[PDB]
Amino acid sequence: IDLYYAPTPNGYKITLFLEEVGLPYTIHPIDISAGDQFKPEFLAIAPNNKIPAIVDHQPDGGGEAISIFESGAILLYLANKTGRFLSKDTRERTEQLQWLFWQVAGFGPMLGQNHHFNRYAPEVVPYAIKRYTEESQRLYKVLNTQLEKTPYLGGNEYSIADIAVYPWAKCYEHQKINLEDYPAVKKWLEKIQQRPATQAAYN
Amino acid sequence: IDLYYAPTPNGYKITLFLEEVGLPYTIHPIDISAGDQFKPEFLAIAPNNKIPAIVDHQPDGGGEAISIFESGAILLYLANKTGRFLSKDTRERTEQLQWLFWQVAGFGPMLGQNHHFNRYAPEVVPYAIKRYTEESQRLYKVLNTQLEKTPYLGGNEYSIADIAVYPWAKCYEHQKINLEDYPAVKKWLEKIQQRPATQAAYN
Ligand SMILES: N[C@@H](CCC(=O)N[C@@H](CS)C(=O)NCC(=O)O)C(=O)O
Ligand SMILES: N[C@@H](CCC(=O)N[C@@H](CS)C(=O)NCC(=O)O)C(=O)O
Ligand SMILES: N[C@@H](CCC(=O)N[C@@H](CS)C(=O)NCC(=O)O)C(=O)O
Ligand SMILES: N[C@@H](CCC(=O)N[C@@H](CS)C(=O)NCC(=O)O)C(=O)O
Ligand SMILES: [Cl-]
């Protein structure tokens, strides 16, 4: 597995997964501050100009390498290939995938806008900062509400849903989120932080 | 299938799919202007307070009903259940799913911010409107570039990737997008508009 990577929340999703399974991989660093993500060779693999992306040179089918962009798609592909971190039971699987989709469609995109507008003086973008601050709070509340019910996000076991959420939730301080308002999220963060693969990916 | 629905881009994704397959469904209208999405009975099904959501009372397993929120998760679940609009070949499937994820994580979320900031006088939110206008252009360019290469989004056949994108791309005028800049997108919109299920869902 070739992983096109930068040390960002979306990059860490994939190294978390790979470190949990112990699947060999080669990191191809993409310097997103340098614009490496716009180079033609990268766009061939990842036409949306974003990391992460992978190339699997040993697809189950044999044959041509398979390239994939979108962290959610990569997680699903790898979970299917390895049979790890995603249930094969339709009910459990569907719950896990619902929360994966919730992460890629809402948690990541909106917290990312929160990150973006924190690059401005607040007085300069008052409507935007209010919008994304309030939405960040709503998202953490949704997350906390689920984690009050189940030990992991939509289930009894660590899954790709949790792997997708963790690198974003780990950044709560940058999002100006008061984690004391979300005690179940706090305990879940603490729990995932103790996993050796988490420490390895963030080393 | 019970579908919790409003006539919005994300709602139409699901009625497009159901109309293509001819799977019976019951619409449960959720008046999102009235705040129906915050009612406890709805939150039980869709804790993120958004439509669409479904309840499948006849899951393959038999047994308890399965509830699902997130349009991407619903599309995947229904495509798997029916065996329609998503390939069973690993390569084709992976390409389709990559583009599904791209839609739910980027195309929808960012065009939705474009929609939101068009509710303001432009002089009042100059940074936000510029950001989401430029991002909308980037997204249409990515879409157009792919549709120059393949007749449908990541493939030779209409799939859940196309179904996910269409209701958002159909709204280009509202996004202040000049569709003449994206001729492949224009032809693809025209093509999908001719499908009887498209007309049915939008009737
Ligand atoms: N929806 C995408 C988001 C990926 C993303 O936002 N990547 C960022 C770094 S975390 C990136 O490559 N930005 C480069 C750019 O926008 O030019 C995913 O889940 O993979
Ligand atoms: N072009 C991007 C560059 C910054 C970026 O890529 N941010 C990433 C996180 S490193 C993001 O918000 N991704 C959103 C997501 O994951 O959906 C922007 O202006 O926001
Ligand atoms: N990522 C979600 C987005 C769903 C969404 O944005 N739904 C809107 C209508 S299109 C909604 O229910 N808004 C209600 C609210 O935000 O209160 C999906 O793909 O299903
Ligand atoms: N609370 C939402 C209400 C509007 C809404 O739900 N917009 C939908 C479209 S109807 C949206 O942008 N969804 C984003 C997505 O599909 O990811 C907001 O303030 O933006
Ligand atoms: Cl699957």
TrEMBL record, chains A, B:
Coiled coil: none annotated. Glutathione 3 binds at residues 115, 171. Pfam families: GST_C, GST_N. Residues 89-203 form the GST C-terminal domain. Glutathione 1 binds at residues 8, 10, 37, 50-51, 71. Residues 1-86 form the GST N-terminal domain. GO terms for molecular function: disulfide oxidoreductase activity. Signal peptide: none annotated. Glutathione 2 binds at residues 10, 131. Belongs to the GST superfamily. This is Glutathione S-transferase enzyme with thioredoxin-like domain. The gene is yfcG.
